[PDB]
Amino acid sequence: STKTNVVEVLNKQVANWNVLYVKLHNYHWYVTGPHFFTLHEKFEEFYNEAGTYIDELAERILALEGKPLATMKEYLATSSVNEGTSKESAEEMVQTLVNDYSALIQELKEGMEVAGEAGDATSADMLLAIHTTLEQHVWMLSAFLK
Amino acid sequence: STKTNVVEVLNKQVANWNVLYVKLHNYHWYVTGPHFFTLHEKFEEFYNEAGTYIDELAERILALEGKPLATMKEYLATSSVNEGTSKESAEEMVQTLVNDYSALIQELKEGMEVAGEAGDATSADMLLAIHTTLEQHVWMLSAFLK
Amino acid sequence: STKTNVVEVLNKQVANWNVLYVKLHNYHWYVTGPHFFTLHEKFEEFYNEAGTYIDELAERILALEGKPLATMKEYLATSSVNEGTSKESAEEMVQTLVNDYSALIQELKEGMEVAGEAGDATSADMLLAIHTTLEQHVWMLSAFLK
Amino acid sequence: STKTNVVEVLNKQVANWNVLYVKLHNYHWYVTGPHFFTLHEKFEEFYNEAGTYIDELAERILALEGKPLATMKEYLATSSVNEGTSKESAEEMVQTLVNDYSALIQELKEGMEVAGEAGDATSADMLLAIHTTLEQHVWMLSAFLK
Amino acid sequence: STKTNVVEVLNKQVANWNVLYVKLHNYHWYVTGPHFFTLHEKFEEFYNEAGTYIDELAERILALEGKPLATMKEYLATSSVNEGTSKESAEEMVQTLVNDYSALIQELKEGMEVAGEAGDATSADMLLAIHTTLEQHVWMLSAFLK
Amino acid sequence: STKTNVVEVLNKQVANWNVLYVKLHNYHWYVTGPHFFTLHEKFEEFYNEAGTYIDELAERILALEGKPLATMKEYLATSSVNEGTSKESAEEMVQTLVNDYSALIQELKEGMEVAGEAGDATSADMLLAIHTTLEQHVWMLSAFLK
Amino acid sequence: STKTNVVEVLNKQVANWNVLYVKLHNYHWYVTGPHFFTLHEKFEEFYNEAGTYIDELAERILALEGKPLATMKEYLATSSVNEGTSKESAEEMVQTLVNDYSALIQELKEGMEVAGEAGDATSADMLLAIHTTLEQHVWMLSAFLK
Amino acid sequence: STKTNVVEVLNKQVANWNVLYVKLHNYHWYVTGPHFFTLHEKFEEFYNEAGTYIDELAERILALEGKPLATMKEYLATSSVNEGTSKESAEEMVQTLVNDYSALIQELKEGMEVAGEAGDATSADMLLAIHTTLEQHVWMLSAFLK
Amino acid sequence: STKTNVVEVLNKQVANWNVLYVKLHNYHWYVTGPHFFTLHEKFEEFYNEAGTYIDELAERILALEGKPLATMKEYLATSSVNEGTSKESAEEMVQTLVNDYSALIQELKEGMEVAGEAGDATSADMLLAIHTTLEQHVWMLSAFLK
Amino acid sequence: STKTNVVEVLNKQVANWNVLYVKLHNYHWYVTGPHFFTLHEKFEEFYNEAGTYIDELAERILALEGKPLATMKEYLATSSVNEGTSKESAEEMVQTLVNDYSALIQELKEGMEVAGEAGDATSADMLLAIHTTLEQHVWMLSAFLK
Amino acid sequence: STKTNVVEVLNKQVANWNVLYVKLHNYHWYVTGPHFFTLHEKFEEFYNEAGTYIDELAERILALEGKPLATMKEYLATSSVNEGTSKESAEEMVQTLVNDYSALIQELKEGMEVAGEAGDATSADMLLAIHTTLEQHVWMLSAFLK
Amino acid sequence: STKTNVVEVLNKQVANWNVLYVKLHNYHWYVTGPHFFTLHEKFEEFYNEAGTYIDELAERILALEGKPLATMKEYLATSSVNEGTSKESAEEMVQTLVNDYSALIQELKEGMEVAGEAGDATSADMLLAIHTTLEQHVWMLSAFLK
Numbered sequence A, B, C, D, E, F, G, H, I, J, K, L: 001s002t003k004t005n006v007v008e009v010l011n012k013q014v015a016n017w018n019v020l021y022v023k024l025h026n027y028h029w030y031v032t033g034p035h036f037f038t039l040h041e042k043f044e045e046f047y048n049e050a051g052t053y054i055d056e057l058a059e060r061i062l063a064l065e066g067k068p069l070a071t072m073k074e075y076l077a078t079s080s081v082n083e084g085t086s087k088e089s090a091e092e093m094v095q096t097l098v099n100d101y102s103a104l105i106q107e108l109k110e111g112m113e114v115a116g117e118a119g120d121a122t123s124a125d126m127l128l129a130i131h132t133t134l135e136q137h138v139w140m141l142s143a144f145l146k
């Protein structure tokens, strides 16, 4: 792995978390049903984390002398996360998030491989920190769906 | 003015502030020069306000039974703000923001006209609150450029 | 509009919010069902706002040299809000509140007309502030009922 | 004493404290004279305590499987406290409160007898807690009147 | 009653609250269903109180020159609370807790009898404080189950 | 109305609040009598608000590209508020403030007319915010004088 | 028991806690040895509690229309606690406090008897609250002495 | 001046502030009249300062290897402040305090002379700090008496 | 290593920390000697950490779709930590803890091996975090024993 | 030196700090250039200190039975500080402040001479406290100008 | 790698961070130029981190039974960082820090190799934590220099 | 005395406190024995004060246009404090500190003479502030050694 490989892995997540920031706002606004208050709030906490993550990842890429993706056009052309359709039920939103977080978990695992093979412990650790939280999110969200 | 006219004005700003949220991150990350610390921090405060604004505007549209724009594809197709090119100097970034805020100020003025003619005092007031802050931003930023 | 017209509009709301303070306590205490914790807490926040509102409205009437209604007998003879029957389901309570808030929203709209035609910007603004929050409440509560 | 006897004693206080909540607002708003600032603030603290008390007493009645009174019509038909006439001087207001608190103190004493004879230590203790504070209030208020 | 009788009553609760601390963790971890977030959090607050209670009860026994039970083997041989089976539904967990709290309420009542007949007002009061909270818990939890 | 008309109205208040800042210090220092503690503190809170107001008004004038008055010589030549004579009784000080606030209230009303006719909602709102507080002050202060 | 009997019991403690406030300062200042930091701090916390107690007890006597002892000459003529000799070792100070607290515990027990037989639940409870803490202090302090 | 001279001056104040701590409690408890709330609170703040002062002065004497007076018997035999008679009006209490503080101010002045002539800048400064506050107290209290 | 191997390692620690939570309470309650205050407090901080650890470890096992041990019977049958005998001196307690922490350190080292060989970076990191603190504890505790 | 000499020295500073309060607002509002944010904020902190100083100095003059200057007309006729011309560059503003602070430092030195020769340690110390801060300001501001 | 190898790597950093603590104070004190406020503050934050680091590294060496370097003579004989010459411009200071941090980054990388090859995950992680921050510092500081 | 004499006295303390900062870390790390927790913490508080002192003294020298010593080589060549030998017992460490603080107290006394004879009240006061605390430290530390 090279520093450039790590910059690329970091940028994919910058893109993903920007798309997720918007998608979480989508679900935060469009949730309905007796579990409105729970999800509305939950999704807000999630988007808050998404925002901290975008700045963290981007600033680590600057730390390694890289260029963080910084346009919506680029996030859309780079992210692997589908945007909200704003039509799904509360159930669909939670299942979609389990799916999205799950996919991101898989991306983080590979991303940590790349950073490790490039001898980049800090970037690996940053990615790990998100991985740890997303895995917590998936359990709780899957539990919710019973 | 109709409630739908107001929903439209509100959505243009939802789109604008999402694009600005990203653009402010762009400038926050790419700023260089002896005024790095000042701008880096300043732009961060600005993006923080942008984020609060997106949720406020969108939730007011829900309050009026409207659909807030909730996809990046839609923000790009709707916003009137150009995305960061990530190549400008510290000077260019500040001047661009004065220009962006200035244009948004003009949009808010019209937007407040529409809400007023629709008998919508709350939406008018929300828009005013941003207008008041942006005008403060423009003075300080223009002062900076001497 | 005259100052007296505004004092009257303000007093109707003083009466309404006193009746609502009690009604919200009613629902806060009598809620049952798997959404007990959500509503119990929610209604408590609502009654907290009701209490702040009674003092605000009454103190604005003092500010304009008026007499704020200050007896339960007068609130009952003046308010347009029906008291809780303490027998409704969680669903009924939320629907009733949407209805109550909705009616109050309509009263506020007229009340703001009166204050405006009397050249009373402060009272108009106070009434607006509640209007803005109630509209937020109605969206969330209606969302809850799916 | 039976649990029902205790529920009744608790409800009389729920009614009394609701009537007092309004009466304290009355005095808070109508106080005049060089001791305006003192009393205005003092009465506000008093109404704040009244509000906490209504919820506490009512929730203890729920705890014992009872129905807390939850309508203004019922508070008026049950409370032993006369509503404010909003015409009294600062002196009259304080003396009236000494009288009201004093009467409530006597009600609490009997109420604690009933709870004790029903083997209800928690309700007795709750009532005691108010008794302790009201006795403090009476001393200070009587001291004020010299 | 003797001081030793009171030490015994206190130790049964030390044992009970240790077993409950674990059982509450069980339910906190194994809860599933759309009410996951509510119960997960609720049970956490409950275990937090259980922990404060174990230290309080044990330190009162030290205060009376007694030996607080301090081994898991002893808690299991002394507590009257059945451990979680980790297989029950969200409904079962809440009903079980209502049952457990209810039984503990009955134990506290007797325990307060013993302390009173031993002339031990402080221990009686400590036990009362828990009794008061558990009764609040039972109402809310029973309300939840509709 | 023109932007210049609004800048002028804003500057008159900048001048007034500077003169009031000093006058409030005068009364804060020279108050005597059994109501020393009340007024001394009250006047301090008032001067604190006066200081926030000077900066707010001046910064809004900068926001509109105007020059805020910034010399004592200019405040004295522009303000309509008479300076403290430092010889009045506690009664005179409070009555004087009711008079001063009352006059400022009348100035704000006209000032809001001007901003409105210039299409300047933000400046109108800023002025309103003070108007709302001064009216509260006048009621309390007039109440004090019985 | 009569209210006067309770006033007397309360005053003995007002006297005792004033003498203890000074004695605790004595030990706080004169402690030496490797356990200086522990005791110095500990005694400070103890004197802090002593001060809160003096005001609480005295204000309860005012609540019952009594005269709280308020002179050093009277505290010395009434307290049953011997003043510090300022010559004892760290060991002696702790043992003395165990003895002093122990004696006060015995006084509180009787004092609670008197309040109970006078039908004074609040004063009994106040005294209990100190009793509960002193018993905690005695255990810890006796533990310290091994 | 010698270190012993300074220790003596410090001890007179330790004695004075202990006597004042009690006297301030006296006035705090026995104040009556429409200025009850003001004085009651004021005297409490004063006694709070008295308590901090006793520990500060005593710890400075320890710092200079001296023995701080630590018995009530010694404070009474050393202080120059007369104890409260608990019979004076609110007016008398305030005038007495002006007199007491005034006398202490005169003692501090001499005490600072002694510390200065002993080359003890720290003790001089400690004494000064109280002197500065007492002079503030005297102005406010004298102002109160008109 | 497999995910199941990691779940097993995590559960052994869930069991160990539950047993330690109780044992730390044992030492917290039974400590005596001039170092009572130090150890009593220290052990409390230790048990506080033990409690956070149980929830963290268990929630990570849920994250990996495993079943966390949740009964006292299972903790006793699984933990490798001996329960307190409540008879040891302060010295014995500290030495025992050094021994217990030391053994746990060795378990964590192996546990981190297993997580690493299973490609489980998050669980490895969680275990590391405890390892880091326990090693700090052992140094301080060994230092204490000189 | 006499008390009157000290009152005069104190009043000159009351006047100076009032003029400086306005001048600092002048520079706070009129600063421009890339160091806008730095100075704008810096000057605000400076004016905040100026405000605390005016009240402190004036209250010390009351403490010594003097009349603090309390009119703008008197500050202008007494202060030795020239008002802002609102036309200077950022550089000029900072240099002017170094000059103003420097002159005030020289005034404080003389002022402390006067207080010392009048045997007024408290006023001398108050003046010293400002002197200490202004000297810090001058270093930083001179450093800024390179 | 052996534990001793890790102790050595840790001690080199203890020495480096002590030398940096002083050097950062040097730059904090000697900075001049229009970027005085920025750097002065920035360097202070940096020295604050340096201080936390010295204690962390040293306490980890104690944790591994090692001797942390604890004399200035040893830091100077061991550190690889050159001390400040106190003569450099603001530019030189920042460039020097980029160079110093950069060198330390390279030392940390090797140091983490050693800890890893010794099977010391905790020490490796501690070193990583600094590495992560220093890399952030270098980007910002290099950005500043344009 | 001249300003240069004062700069020299200030620099000796800058050197001393830097050497003490390291020495306190030495004792903080190397303390052992049953009083580990006490001293470990105590020494940490002491080093914290040492750090604040270095910056204060150095910034006062900048205030007087002097050059603060800013290299370890210079501190070692200037300080009069011997560095820790890291071999002493807990007893030796405390005695050494009493000796070190005592010597510094003597240096401060002379240093205050110099500042006074140079007409430098601020520097004299700064030095006094440390003197006052060190004398407190010596009493407590000497008390500890019995």
Ligand SMILES: [Fe+3]
Binding pocket: A055, A059, B028, B044
């Ligand atoms: Fe950032």
Ligand SMILES: [Fe+3]
Binding pocket: A028, A044, B055, B059
């Ligand atoms: Fe939202």
Ligand SMILES: [Fe+3]
Binding pocket: C055, C059, D028, D044
């Ligand atoms: Fe109010």
Ligand SMILES: [Fe+3]
Binding pocket: C028, C044, D055, D059
């Ligand atoms: Fe409630």
Ligand SMILES: [Fe+3]
Binding pocket: E055, E059, I028, I044
């Ligand atoms: Fe405990």
Ligand SMILES: [Fe+3]
Binding pocket: F055, F059, J028, J044
């Ligand atoms: Fe400002």
Ligand SMILES: [Fe+3]
Binding pocket: G055, G059, H028, H044
């Ligand atoms: Fe009190």
Ligand SMILES: [Fe+3]
Binding pocket: G028, G044, H055, H059
């Ligand atoms: Fe002390």
Ligand SMILES: [Fe+3]
Binding pocket: E028, E044, I055, I059
């Ligand atoms: Fe949890």
Ligand SMILES: [Fe+3]
Binding pocket: F028, F044, J055, J059
């Ligand atoms: Fe003041």
Ligand SMILES: [Fe+3]
Binding pocket: K055, K059, L028, L044
């Ligand atoms: Fe440390």
Ligand SMILES: [Fe+3]
Binding pocket: K028, K044, L055, L059
């Ligand atoms: Fe500094």
